[PDB]
Amino acid sequence: HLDSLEDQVERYKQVLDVMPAGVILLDTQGIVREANPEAQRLLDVPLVGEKWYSVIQIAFAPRDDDGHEISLRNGRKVRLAISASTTGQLILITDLTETRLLQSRISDLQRLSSLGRMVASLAHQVRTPLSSAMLYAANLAAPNLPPATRERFQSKLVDRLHDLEKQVNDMLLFAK
Amino acid sequence: LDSLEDQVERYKQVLDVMPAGVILLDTQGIVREANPEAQRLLDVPLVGEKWYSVIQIAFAPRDDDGHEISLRNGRKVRLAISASTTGQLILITDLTETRLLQSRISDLQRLSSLGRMVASLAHQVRTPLSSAMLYAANLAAPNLPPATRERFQSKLVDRLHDLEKQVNDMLLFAKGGDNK
């Protein structure tokens, strides 16, 4: 059927409507002839019936921090995707506003986690001396050991207790 | 007249280089269409497969999954179900990158919390260690009651475990591993 094509393109338009990505359909001249709701959302400016380059001097605000994405003047940070297509170019837009927003919060919290991350580290180190401390502690319960043998393990135990006390103090020094 | 063919190939490319997956089912629930993105995300064959069969092989839900749905590969994608004349129109978006970030923040704020409790997590850590050394030092005399000696002996082990447990509480808390 020839009408089936109308129903086919109908299901296609259906995609662009609920598609979570901007779709700008330019023309040989360079005019926005079509824009889905996601495109109008991010740009938040008149799209259809405007000049692509003109839209760039309104909803776009380039910055140095911008790499793969481009900062919109409305605050959003989006990535552009230009592809080869005859009879107008296609431009797919993605919303990475949240992406960079989350990234701009890890750097700040990365320094705040320094002290905490140091304690977490010093805590993992304690597992080593403690492991050896429990072994030498069990040797104190071993059978048939001379008097000078009990003091040997005891002497080796205090070493672990000391090496362990210096790590906890190091940890229990970051405080208040 | 011919404003369709040219408009078809135009939209035909949109789904080709689309950054989001597009799945079109029918009433029975059989996969009929699948763009390259969807294939990359799901990996397993789609074209000519029962959607419910794919859900078992492709998807792999979890409890931690809030809005998104974890896939077999581990990536977390969000499903957007939309009405359609011919079955449903399921779109797939990848939020593995976001989630990852959302998980990091928590872990960072997690470490900060431990950094503020270091003060309170002091008395709980020195108490057992101090005892271990208090008894360990006593077990170094010329000769003393054997029963009393074995009495202190039992203390140590318990003191060390109390500490061990107190230290494992920190690491487990510090490890975070939540809000993934």
Author numbering:
A (entry chain B): 12 to 187
B (entry chain A): 13 to 192
Q: Would you copy out the relevant sentences from the publication that reported this structure?
A:
FlrB is a histidine kinase with a conserved dimerization and histidine phosphotransfer domain (DHp; aa 125-191) and catalytic and ATP binding domain (CA; aa 234–340).
Interestingly, although full-length FlrB was subjected to crystallization, crystals contained only FlrB aa 12–192 in the longest fragment (chain E). In the crystals, the FlrB12-192 fragments form an asymmetric dimer in which the two chains adopt different conformations; this can be seen if the PAS domains in each chain are superimposed. This asymmetric fold has not been observed in dimer structures of other histidine kinases (HKs). The structure of the PAS domain is in good agreement (r.m.s.d. = 0.759 Å) with a further truncated FlrB PAS domain structure (aa 8–123) that was previously reported. Members of this cluster have substituted Fα and Gβ elements of the prototypical PAS structure with a unique short loop region. H135 is C-terminal to the kink in the alpha helix in the FlrB1-192 crystal structure.
